[PDB]
Amino acid sequence: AQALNTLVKQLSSNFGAISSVLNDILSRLDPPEAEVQIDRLITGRLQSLQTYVTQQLIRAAEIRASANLAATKMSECVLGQSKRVDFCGKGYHLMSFPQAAPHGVVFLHVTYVPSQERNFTTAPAICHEGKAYFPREGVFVFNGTSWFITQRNFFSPQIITTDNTFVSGNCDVVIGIINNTVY
Amino acid sequence: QQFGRDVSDFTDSVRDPKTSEILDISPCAFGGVSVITPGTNASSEVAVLYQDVNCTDVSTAIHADQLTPAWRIYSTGNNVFQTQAGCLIGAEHVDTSYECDIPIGAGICASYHTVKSIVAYTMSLGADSSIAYSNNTIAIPTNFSISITTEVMPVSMAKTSVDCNMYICGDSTECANLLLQYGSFC
Amino acid sequence: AIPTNFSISITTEVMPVSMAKTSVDCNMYICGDSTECANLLLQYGSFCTQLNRALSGIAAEQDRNTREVFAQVKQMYKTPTLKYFGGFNFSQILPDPLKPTKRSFIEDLLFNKVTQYGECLGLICAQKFNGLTVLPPLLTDDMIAAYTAALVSGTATAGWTFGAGAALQIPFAMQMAYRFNGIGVTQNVLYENQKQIANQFNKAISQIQESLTTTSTALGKLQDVVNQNAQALNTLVKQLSSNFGAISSVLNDILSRLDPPEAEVQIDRLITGRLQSLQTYVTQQLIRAAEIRASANLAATKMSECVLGQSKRVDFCGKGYHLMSFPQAAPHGVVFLHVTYVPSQERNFTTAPAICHEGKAYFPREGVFVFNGTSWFITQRNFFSPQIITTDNTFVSGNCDVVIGIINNTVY
Amino acid sequence: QQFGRDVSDFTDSVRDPKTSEILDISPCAFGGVSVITPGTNASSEVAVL
Ligand SMILES: *[C@@H]1O[C@H](CO)[C@@H](O[C@@H]2O[C@H](CO)[C@@H](O[C@@H]3O[C@H](CO)[C@@H](O)[C@H](O[C@H]4O[C@H](CO)[C@@H](O)[C@H](O)[C@@H]4O)[C@@H]3O)[C@H](O)[C@H]2NC(C)=O)[C@H](O)[C@H]1NC(C)=O
Ligand SMILES: *[C@@H]1O[C@H](CO)[C@@H](O[C@@H]2O[C@H](CO)[C@@H](O[C@@H]3O[C@H](CO)[C@@H](O)[C@H](O[C@H]4O[C@H](CO)[C@@H](O)[C@H](O)[C@@H]4O)[C@@H]3O)[C@H](O)[C@H]2NC(C)=O)[C@H](O)[C@H]1NC(C)=O
Ligand SMILES: *[C@@H]1O[C@H](CO)[C@@H](O[C@@H]2O[C@H](CO)[C@@H](O[C@@H]3O[C@H](CO[C@H]4O[C@H](CO)[C@@H](O)[C@H](O)[C@@H]4O)[C@@H](O)[C@H](O)[C@@H]3O)[C@H](O)[C@H]2NC(C)=O)[C@H](O)[C@H]1NC(C)=O
Ligand SMILES: *[C@@H]1O[C@H](CO)[C@@H](O[C@@H]2O[C@H](CO)[C@@H](O[C@@H]3O[C@H](CO)[C@@H](O)[C@H](O)[C@@H]3O)[C@H](O)[C@H]2NC(C)=O)[C@H](O)[C@H]1NC(C)=O
Ligand SMILES: *[C@@H]1O[C@H](CO)[C@@H](O[C@@H]2O[C@H](CO)[C@@H](O[C@@H]3O[C@H](CO)[C@@H](O)[C@H](O)[C@@H]3O)[C@H](O)[C@H]2NC(C)=O)[C@H](O)[C@H]1NC(C)=O
Ligand SMILES: *[C@@H]1O[C@H](CO)[C@@H](O[C@@H]2O[C@H](CO)[C@@H](O)[C@H](O)[C@H]2NC(C)=O)[C@H](O)[C@H]1NC(C)=O
Ligand SMILES: *[C@@H]1O[C@H](CO)[C@@H](O[C@@H]2O[C@H](CO)[C@@H](O)[C@H](O)[C@H]2NC(C)=O)[C@H](O)[C@H]1NC(C)=O
Ligand SMILES: *[C@@H]1O[C@H](CO)[C@@H](O[C@@H]2O[C@H](CO)[C@@H](O)[C@H](O)[C@H]2NC(C)=O)[C@H](O)[C@H]1NC(C)=O
Ligand SMILES: *[C@@H]1O[C@H](CO)[C@@H](O[C@@H]2O[C@H](CO)[C@@H](O)[C@H](O)[C@H]2NC(C)=O)[C@H](O)[C@H]1NC(C)=O
Ligand SMILES: *[C@@H]1O[C@H](CO)[C@@H](O)[C@H](O)[C@H]1NC(C)=O
Ligand SMILES: *[C@@H]1O[C@H](CO)[C@@H](O)[C@H](O)[C@H]1NC(C)=O
Ligand SMILES: *[C@@H]1O[C@H](CO)[C@@H](O)[C@H](O)[C@H]1NC(C)=O
Ligand SMILES: *[C@@H]1O[C@H](CO)[C@@H](O)[C@H](O)[C@H]1NC(C)=O
Ligand SMILES: *[C@@H]1O[C@H](CO)[C@@H](O)[C@H](O)[C@H]1NC(C)=O
Ligand SMILES: *[C@@H]1O[C@H](CO)[C@@H](O)[C@H](O)[C@H]1NC(C)=O
């Protein structure tokens, strides 16, 4: 809108000519002096087009830069599930919804947000049978009643078995091994 | 040597041709003006920023009526401060921090706060919080929530076209004949 | 060939995020305060408005670029006193609170190796005879360092959680344990090789410190944006002294000698030549500012993906497998410290795709069949560590003697 | 009043000097031209937009 208003308003600029109207100059002046001053107007009006055309070329590049971003971001998140951090929404991305717009696109990014965090005392491994038992997944926690293994995305207890715990290296190697008995 | 020049072509310093004293020249004052407003709805007073000036010459030129432009109803109002941006006039200094509402420059912002009036303050980055450190404990999330956030980005543009003779000529015959001497510039 | 030993290495990357905000005033750059000059630029057009609006828009998006990169922090967190987290010495990356300029010792060296117009510093707010000015940024350098100190102190005591969401209290060896697992290796190795990892970490810290103490390069991205904006202004200054095909370069030598009828002819040609150089400078800054946002869009990605997370893309955040990333501040730019993982010291042996045992073909759930001349076992592709071939870790399906390369062994 | 103007300074409506019948003025006619072809390999006939 501002690009077209500038292209419009400089039709009425004199650009140092006798007027900004070619009809005034054809009527008032002699065909030598008329032809000079309308030539002064024809080059001021060409420069106003060239400036407008150039700044359309710049913003046509930036919108293509976002359109190539949106065509990617639709394929990444609408047509799938993203795994990049904070791409397609803040948190943990689940899915996203495209919505049309008069000159663009509006996304609706569905994210997961954890909360309600609680203290649990932790340690790397369990020293059972003289063996440093490392968790196959998750970390070791003690909630004040039981030692067990849970994830870090959410709190959920699991009984410490050899199916979710394994050993690489014996004891007295890792600093801070749990001295507990497991199954 | 009679006078000195700057790194441009301007003579920044002259010697007195009478008593040989060496005198710098300062380009008395100019700069831009911005208008700091709460909006026409929320108030009717505005604050002006005289950009990149010493407030000694600004407050002088207000009272000495040496300003261009000048307003018929205008006053300094005892609220003038020299920041790195220049002379904010029409706003009270606040020496605590808040979040940036309207950005001014060099970390200082402004808003329309309770006495409401226009006040100037320094931007805060956030809360003075802390992340404790343990060698033994891990905080683990238990409950949760979901949230849907929207974002928005253009993918197109109002594509135009411009005819030359309805723009540079207005369909006059003489303009079309001069246009032949510029070629197919159109 | 499967690697056995390893080392960690910290490779740095830089990029610009910011062009210096400029502004100009034709009334001063065009005229030098001649009134008749002001009365002949009108008669051309309020082009002055388009210029002022163009430069302020280019300038205002430089403050947007800086907040988009740095200001990803919701709360300012304090500097902990303990900095030898399990031996990991973090005194160089953190700001030094004993100094008045509470910057990191890296950022001290980053400032020094990086570092015509009116400007105001302190507070001596001087002006120039030219119409040029530079504008100070909204987000000051101390505030830039305060975002940067929260990104490092927050990573040192909350780690993976710091960017993922609410920052969670966690020991730093536990933070390593989740990060080192995430690249496809077993987290025993960190506890097994802790002092080796702690020394290799502190090695590459001092390597970067001595590299940036004695450097002549690797900051060419930052200084080029400084120099390219400086050479645009010097061209804009020096063309004031040109006649532009008029009788004189000074308006008070034109109106002096010539009578005011023909003086205004020569004044028009001197104004018009000064308008075009002013208009072209705006277009040149308009192109260069659009260039820098592509680096600012990279830095906004590369902070939230790499510092506030862990990156799994190829050669993103240095070469190797990414573990951590420490941001540092720079004039008109950012500095990253990417801690990557490098496997090393490979050995030959013979491998196989399948084992025949009791008429069926057995396949690894993950890893390869490894025969070192003595016996067969399973290990991973990123570290050499034996696993006895049992049906717990070897997936059993299909018949023997169908796949190319099924070898008679025993699976227990 | 004698005549009207647009949102920009172009006279779009003139009140008649004789009858005072006010009359809008539109542009006379202009625009762009495009040509549809299936190719010189396929035909010699074109359609014009
Ligand atoms: C806005 O412009 C005004 C113009 O008057 C300017 O005020 C002047 O600033 C200078 C710089 O501070 C002042 O000069 C100093 O004044 C103090 C007290 O008056 C003296 O103690 C100083 O003497 C010491 O400092 C000198 C330089 O540091 C030494 O060379 C000297 O040997 C002394 O050790 C010095 O005279 C000057 O007095 C004021 N003028 C007035 C009227 O106040 C102001 O600084 C500008 N604004 C800003 C923000 O800079
Ligand atoms: C993978 O390769 C790395 C190579 O970096 C290798 O780590 C190195 O192991 C050796 C031996 O274990 C280390 O050498 C010792 O390190 C300690 C650490 O403080 C030093 O104190 C030692 O110096 C004493 O011992 C010397 C020999 O007895 C004496 O001559 C001397 O006077 C001292 O009394 C000695 O240097 C070496 O430091 C590490 N390297 C690092 C960076 O830690 C690792 O073992 C390889 N791993 C595998 C699985 O191949
Ligand atoms: C984990 O977080 C969850 C939230 O994300 C928790 O679920 C919430 O639990 C609370 C109680 O602790 C419920 O609050 C009650 O809700 C009823 C129903 O409110 C609705 O209906 C009324 C009337 O139509 C309407 O006015 C409201 O706006 C609601 O639409 C109220 O009547 C009660 O006064 C009380 O507020 C929440 O409703 C419930 N949320 C949901 C989505 O069900 C969950 O309990 C947490 N778990 C743990 C272990 O902390
Ligand atoms: C720390 O975590 C452990 C689990 O890892 C918690 O122990 C659990 O306590 C609940 C108490 O309600 C037990 O639930 C009940 O179990 C009986 C027996 O099966 C069942 O009949 C009931 O219907 C009910 O589900 C649960 O079994 C028990 N789990 C284990 C493995 O012991 C412990 O309470 C936690 N500590 C604190 C302070 O909360
Ligand atoms: C110039 O002005 C004169 C007078 O102001 C106009 O003449 C009058 O015009 C009105 C309507 O325009 C005529 O009324 C009509 O008369 C016809 C026949 O007389 C009848 O069929 C209609 O029903 C209506 O009554 C009026 O007679 C006429 N008077 C005279 C003396 O001519 C004239 O029209 C104006 N010029 C133009 C171009 O409009
Ligand atoms: C962890 O538990 C083991 C037992 O499983 C402890 O080992 C005992 O250590 C003492 C000396 O420290 C010996 O006298 C015992 O003979 C050991 N027990 C066995 C069965 O051999 C070990 O000390 C415990 N660790 C800690 C820190 O208490
Ligand atoms: C961690 O690194 C810091 C340097 O950043 C070490 O601090 C230096 O220690 C020496 C020995 O006394 C002093 O002479 C230096 O002045 C210290 N540097 C600073 C900036 O104060 C520190 O010793 C290292 N940690 C360990 C455990 O060695
Ligand atoms: C190949 O790897 C195997 C491990 O799976 C090595 O076998 C063990 O070697 C140690 C000492 O070298 C012996 O104490 C064990 O009894 C061996 N176990 C088995 C199951 O053989 C073997 O040594 C490696 N080959 C070579 C040449 O070192
Ligand atoms: C692995 O052992 C099997 C034994 O079942 C071998 O299979 C025999 O191969 C011979 C050919 O050399 C055939 O004549 C037999 O009929 C096969 N036996 C069965 C039960 O089909 C197999 O050759 C061995 N692999 C290698 C490489 O020698
Ligand atoms: C966890 O412990 C810390 C101090 O040890 C305390 O500040 C925090 O409030 C505790 N959080 C919970 C959920 O108990
Ligand atoms: C001008 O004359 C006065 C004495 O009449 C003297 O003090 C001064 O120095 C002279 N000026 C110069 C430039 O010599
Ligand atoms: C204007 O301000 C009033 C409060 O005085 C508020 O209720 C109203 O919504 C505002 N309207 C707009 C358009 O901002
Ligand atoms: C672990 O931290 C506690 C305080 O939080 C401290 O007293 C103890 O010495 C630490 N453990 C080690 C091995 O330093
Ligand atoms: C492994 O063998 C290949 C080819 O046989 C050779 O390139 C390489 O040097 C060997 N490496 C070792 C460690 O023996
Ligand atoms: C297109 O032109 C080629 C000659 O270049 C001709 O052989 C062919 O037949 C033409 N296509 C059709 C559909 O006639």
Author numbering:
A (entry chain C): 938 to 1120
B (entry chain C): 549 to 663, 672 to 742
C (entry chain A): 695 to 809, 818 to 824, 831 to 1120
D (entry chain B): 549 to 597
Please, what does the article write about this entry?
The S1 subunit is responsible for host-receptor binding while the S2 subunit contains the membrane-fusion machinery.
The ‘up’ conformation of the S1 RBD exposes the S1 RBD receptor-binding site. The increased propensity to adopt the ‘up’ S1 RBD conformation may indicate a difference in the coronavirus S containing the 2P mutations, however other differences in sample preparation cannot be fully ruled out.
